[model samples]
Target chain A: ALQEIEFTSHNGRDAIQAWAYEPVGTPTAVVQIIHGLGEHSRRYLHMISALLDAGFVVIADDHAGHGRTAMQSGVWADAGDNAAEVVISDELTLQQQLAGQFDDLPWVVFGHSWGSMIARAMATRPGTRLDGLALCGIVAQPRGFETTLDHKTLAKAMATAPTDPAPEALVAQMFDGFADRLSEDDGPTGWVARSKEVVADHGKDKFNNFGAPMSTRFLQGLADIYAMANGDSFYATMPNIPIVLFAGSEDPAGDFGTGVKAVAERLRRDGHNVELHLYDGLRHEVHNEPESRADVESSLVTFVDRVAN
Target chain B: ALQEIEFTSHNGRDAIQAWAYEPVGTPTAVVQIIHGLGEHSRRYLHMISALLDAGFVVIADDHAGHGRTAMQSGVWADAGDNAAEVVISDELTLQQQLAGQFDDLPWVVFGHSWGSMIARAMATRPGTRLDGLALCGIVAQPRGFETTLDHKTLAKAMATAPTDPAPEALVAQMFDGFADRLSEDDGPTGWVARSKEVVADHGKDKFNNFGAPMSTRFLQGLADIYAMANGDSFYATMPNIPIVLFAGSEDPAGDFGTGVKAVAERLRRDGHNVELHLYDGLRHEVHNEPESRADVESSLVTFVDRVANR
Candidate 1:
């Protein structure tokens, strides 16, 4: 059921790692899941199974600075200045290639957490195209998210130029809000998910715990993207696109659902067809939680079917 | 499913390239195919599939002087000082290691062409243990096989001390009888196989036409082994190991099938359990020619099952 594809990203630099799972028969559509920061696509095996069971060809790629691609390119979150552009462009090329192989199948782009940031910026890329876009754990612009980005650290980072690693302290500082929400007994990663097992699993993952060296720079990019989402300017030239946004009620990234509400409202006001939902009692990864996974998968499949038709 | 395993041969001087294919479920037994002269194991994929379909785990290694192993060891038929011993000993070690992995499972050694010589040597080796031996397209001792051996050229080869190949004429002479059997209108490699396609495939093979530098010395080893087969000495102190011999009737090395019969008769006379078979209207490569392959596979499976159960 699983097949791996080894290829060089179109940029001709990073070696991209990807995998595809096929339905038993001809696929009605294809879904490409873009994983979040510090994690690779392999973590989405559960998600892949859901899509595969629905008679879809499911594929995912390890973006540069993540997973095997990071090991190959030898960088974490610093896939060069055009890092975001390279990654988004690479996905587009991969889509085109897969489309050529399985001609006429509708395509969907699904992104989670930090991936949602990249997915949002993808719409702004010129000539961008997709049948549908679903952003999970969509991060709304945090109140004064700009104020939280340390100006002094940015100045020093610019001066260092090629020197590596933001201070480890600043790297850990980015996660302070999530920690503030947890009791001392709850542990450092309690904010990862409502399920203790999920948080424990995330802690054990080597790829998920990537340290602070590129955190400030990478988070700066995320902050900027969130800022774009907050303003109506980023979607300026684009026509109203079919979009779906969803997250857990307790996911810190979506400001515990408040931030998600703002982004969905903003896109709706812009006249785009938007469907939004907040799952109660769930945390950062609704797709990962056993209780909510079925619902999340169902919502995603419904959106895909509606737009694809 | 197919899986590749790369291991260093016991000598530690060369790398051995091998592949193993297992049944969808558990394997009933294991079969290791030893390839022949001027050819590598990849050619045996079809043969391997036949064994696999019978619930057997199939494995094949590219021997020295050919394929990746030859490239790694860097000596065309000169695997090392004692080419045959290096090759045969390596196969013994490979079997022992594999036997260690799948304990209690029956094992078979299926050798073709030049590989038959090595497989026979394995049976002759005091501790060479296996459930069965199947030699396909085995070359028998030609009439006056040893008397006609070009000793003078061999002596020159000895003094050269690892120089270049033997003269081209000697290399051509090695194929003397097979060439004689062909008509002028027949292509150069007509003796290799009856199927023109198979012959053409062999000709295009870079590994096959290694051009006889190592052939002289390697063939020298082959002649010696055949001599052992002809004489009563090799069976000395050896158990009556189960054996099966089969080849194309037109195969030149088997002397139009006369030589294979001789080898099988000799072994039977030596009191070993042996079965002899000759496929009529077939050429040298019984397993490779499409017309004969199915029959060869069926015959081999029957022989293997009989011996393995015994």
Candidate 2:
């Protein structure tokens, strides 16, 4: 059953609505999820339900400044200058509360795309502890860019309309890496996935795409986190814990395993227990790809059991 | 500062008062302690202050029927049939609240003597997760003996009197094992420690000695838990987590290092991470034996740092 729950954000301001999927009989473990940008937590219903059937309780929330939560916050978890900090803090609170509820069950934090970055950022937070962390569709560090305009104004009025006051060259530059992976003939949404059905479904959804005027402050926050993730300070704070990274072989965000492998190598050098996998011929939506869906879920199950055992 | 706190018991029958020792600086971790039988949580003041100085927020409770709580319940955590279960259940509540207070800090549960048995019993309770477990002066499995007698009547009067209704043979038999370790003149308290000064302090305190009548029912519950600890069911539920066992080498309750070593071996055989140490010549009060105190605290600090790198 899909149950909705509300929790106060770490900023102690907005209420974050999270959906929970309870498994049949008693649950052996918990899987808390963080969805990528532009999409809500409900987008992973297929995967969530499958995990529930496998005797695991699942909970996922729409990140601040995105999905239903953003609509309520007026700017969501992004209004403050330390938006990224509050974003991960809110996740910590959620994880802590849920952990108190089922005291015996081990927890695994799972993330995808932008959410994967948030999860890694959380590991650097003092006092953060978990049995395992699973990252899917992770992206590489953002390339260098200089800011030239008022980001505060750009962050406002981003959701309702697409009148982005940010410079056009800066907006196009961010997408260049993703677009560079696609052929000129491929459409705007082609870079998202290889599955035609998944792409069509995503295109039909109004919330799936972020048009012009994506919050400049939000993008800048991502860039700052990306910088931290690439540096020694962030990895220095990373706990000695198990981590698994999985992405599609053709994911432009991860540069078709190149970026993902680099991230894995960096973490492995620090003596972290890490596993990296790339599904051949698949794209960004590996969870949705027909050929990769079963393999990914089974691997997730195996990883969960190994951690729990 | 030693701050006092309260949490409702598992059945909400009474308020359990606990003490908190906050560090002088920012604390990186938490240590929730469970003191041994016949003693209140305050008895660990020496260890508590040292842990606070080492940068850990330590919290401990006088279980129902002991110390301040005993004044209310007339007995400690045992009143009903499932007293052992309720005792550990109350411990779970205390741990849960403390864990929530410092949402970021990893927790280590520390137990000693009877508290060690309670901590082990807690591991079997579904939902009890901890970063590390430290046990000191743990007791061994109960020897087999079947006695058909009403333990309720004897449990009621043990707190205030020297007279006990339980059979004299049964009482003397329980101590025979400890008595066998020493000469006829060594006295019953000799098993606790090799240090005469430590034993003198224990003898001078009224709370330190069990005196004439002990709660047979509570002892029975403890025996049941001891059996559980010796069996496969308890070890089967033991999470793949780190555990450290340290006790006095001359402690008779653990048969010197024999019993403590046995427990550690059982866990190590089952593939659980375990570290065992038996301080030479130190008895049950290894932590308070002046000679072993520094070593014990340093080992604890190292374990905490290993678990909490951040």
Candidate 3:
């Protein structure tokens, strides 16, 4: 059964469009799937199907300024100040409500790409409860490297041009060389996945924000989220729970596995139980890669089963 | 994925039509669902869906002279001599082939109504490996009553009018008072299920042979299957495995629960581990009861889980 839920967003500008896919039989647990930056909850149907087959109730939402929420609000380039925190707050409320409803079952949070960063940031919030956390296509900052965005500079830019498309230079800085590493010429979206079909699909999907420029305000809010997520506060505050991180070895966003390893190492150093899966020869969307999609989904299901059991 | 497999039937007169419903992820086990008389395997979609959700690859077949197989062969009235063994042999071949393909998974057999009788007979066969056996709406004989059908009488009837419609007297003997106990006047098919919708569906379904008079040969084959299922040979030779029996308290086919209870007691006396579920207000089709369907499905899943885990 598909259940639709509407709730006020943390920024209060719009109602978050959320949905829950309940399995046919009694669910073993609850899994809240957080989609990537340029995608929406609907894009995770394959993963959701696997979860449902394994008897897990899945909850997800179209984040503010994306998918139906953005279509309804007409605010694709702006998600208010501190966008990541706003998204996380909305998710937390959803989590609490669903947890209360399925009180006896364990609750798991799974986030991919930018959503993974938001999930990491959510972990730092005091009193947050989660049975397990799984991060896919995780966004990470390489150890000893400067943060991707300078807060003061972004803030200054936002003050003058909050609604304008982000500068080409900034967009180039994030994705300029991602596609160059591929052996074959895969056009602009090659960095998304090894499968040409997946790249083509991502390029053609109207709901996707891929290649769409973000406003300075949105960029600023996103930078803040990234900064907080990669900071020491996460390591200091996250509760002890089973954490599994997944990324493709060739994913540019994960710095070709180095950044993902660093994050895994950091979590391990903090005395957390972490399992890292780095799929070789795949790009950013490990879960979307045809050859490795089943493995990734199965691994996540296995992790959830272990933790939930 | 839906996989279709065709193999020659044990009767050698036709090929068995079978299908396998593979789950999306790794399967924990395999369940072969046997459909009851007058119905095809397609009617068990709800049960199959539940099994798939629980990570079990499901296998089912349209028995000879029934459903797709019958449609293809135009042999609805006759399934050859020793039809019960012919059907069981076909099922065994399908089971072996599936077990070989899914090498590491446990195998379970779930049969409903007349199908349950077939499953019980299968349990008595030597070297029949099963992780679990579940029977729903089982056909059983009352502890003290004589067998419902006499082999000599059925055989003599079949010899003379093998392809003729079974005499109405025999049909009446089997279901004479089944629907009379219902309080709300559910017409002729009330004994089939308590829900009017189910009864209506059964009546309207062209795929079903519900009201169609079976041929004398077909009745003889059915009587032989029931005889084998309820015989002392089954209790004496059946392997010790996890067995579950389900029935409705008001199901006349099960003698309104007494016959079902006697079967369970016999199995227990023979040292078999048995679980019996008797739904209070249901009729013959416990699995099809709208009010208690989920409970029945869940209970079966729970039983399968336990046996598989063990």
Candidate 4:
């Protein structure tokens, strides 16, 4: 019940490696999953299995410069100057193709981490229609809390050395002091998830871009995407779709829930239906944490069911 | 969508490691898969996936002295004197428990290779009820075609050295000349399948019992089961359920289609509805062969669909 789909990439690279997983019975809807940074779509096998069991056709693709896409295209770190838009464009193209095959079903987009930014950007695009959107491990950029990885700083760094790989020190600053927050040490990836097994598996996964540093150009493009996605102007024209924002309270990427709440407040003020869930004592990969995985997955299923019905 | 079930083994050693895979929709039937020699049930993921997509609830377990069962009990090579009977009894116990959970679904047993022999024996047991039975890479003990590994010979070998591991010489004799039949050399497992990838994967799989030799007692027990299952009396009392026999034409275990056809003929003579499939030019593990896998899987689905409907 699984088949791979290869399509031309808008990133001016090789074809994007995507997969479609059909359920046993007629699907109630289609869920397009966009995986987080440093991980590939296959890492969401458990989530996909859950969705299939719920009678949802699931589709996922390895983003440009990540996983099978990078392996096939030989473009590991560099995803071009307009990497974010290219990736979003690739997703929209896939959506259109899938719509032709599976029409008259509710379409939902679930994005995690960096993927959440792309999903947000996709929602803001003109004529983009989505019945439901679920964002997990969201990257929220609250004003005045910008770090070295922010758009302004990354742009400056790109101006100086656009072609070079981002410095190890600057990359390290991204997870700065995150490990100290965890009670147990799972080495570098302890900040990624609460479970040691989850962290270890992430480290061992060959499909992950964990140890591969991104080029300055790629980072700048990502930062620019984040800024555009988080800007007030982006949501001014966005449709009031059902949105669910969830992240672990201890996730450093969400600035330990402050930035997450800030984004939620902004969305609520902008007249959008937003539901926020902050799982206490967990890390970034809420779906991978064994203790909270079932709850997190079930929540998504429940949201989709409600939206679809 | 998947969960593991552990229960006390009939082998009197340890709990059997079993797993149940529930389909998305209401299941049309239930399939209990018994895997082949040296391999575990997890190796049948692709087949299980297909079954799930067809709305069939699947259940499979690691047999005694194989895969998770071996790892859990620390009894890699030694299954008790009645190893075959013990395994069948364990399966029956699981079947009863699953019947409680999924009461009305048509129940089918799909066994492969060594498992096929066990399944045949299960069908022969009194009060045994199965809607359909599929035997793949079946061990058919044709008259006058017995080898050094047959019941009588293994009994003698067990009498001589019952406690010791079956000697490498005798074990190697099981697959003797099979490699020579293949044009290309895939080392020891060349006869397993035609695909190099399949052979190499079997070699690398840590769960497989490929490298471990069985004890004389275990081999004798296995031979005894084969003899019992292949006897004319076994088929006389068996329910007239739909039966499917499939194997690679070149599989040494089925004597290259000779033994398979003989068994099919015997079943037909006994007033049983039987279907036989022999994939030409392929070795054992027909389901794993890329050239014939889709056909083999589809045939199984078709058979299940028919039996369930009836």
State fnat for each of the candidate structures.
Answer: 0.00, 0.00, 0.00, 0.00
Q: Among all windows of ten consecutive residues in candidate 2 chain A, which has the lowest summed lDDT?
A: A142-151
Q: Model 4, B198-238: lDDT tens per residue? A: 77667656677567888887776666677777877777877
Candidate 3: which docking quality band? incorrect
DockQ values for all predictions?
A: 0.03, 0.01, 0.02, 0.03
What is model 4's interface RMSD? 12.4
Model 4 alpha-carbon miss at residue B3, Å: 2.6
Candidate 3: residue B131 lDDT (0-100): 84
Best by TM-score: 4
Deviating ranges (above 4 Å) for candidate 2: A1-309, B11-14, B72-80, B141-170, B173-176, B206-212
TM-score of 4: 0.55
Model 1: per-residue lDDT, tens digit, B98-214? 655567777788888778877777776676766888988776754335345576776677567534565565555556577656777666678778877677657655545435356
TM-score of chain A of 4: 0.92
Per-candidate TM vs. native?
0.53, 0.46, 0.53, 0.55
Report each candidate's C-alpha RMSD, comma-separated, in the order given.
12.2, 19.0, 15.0, 16.1
State in Å the error of residue A309, model 3. 45
State the lDDT of candidate 3 residue by residue for A187-287, as single tens digits. Answer: 77788898886777676555565566787767766667767777888878778889999999988877889888988898899899999999999999999
Q: For candidate 2, state the interface root-mean-square deviation in angstroms to 1 decimal.
A: 26.0
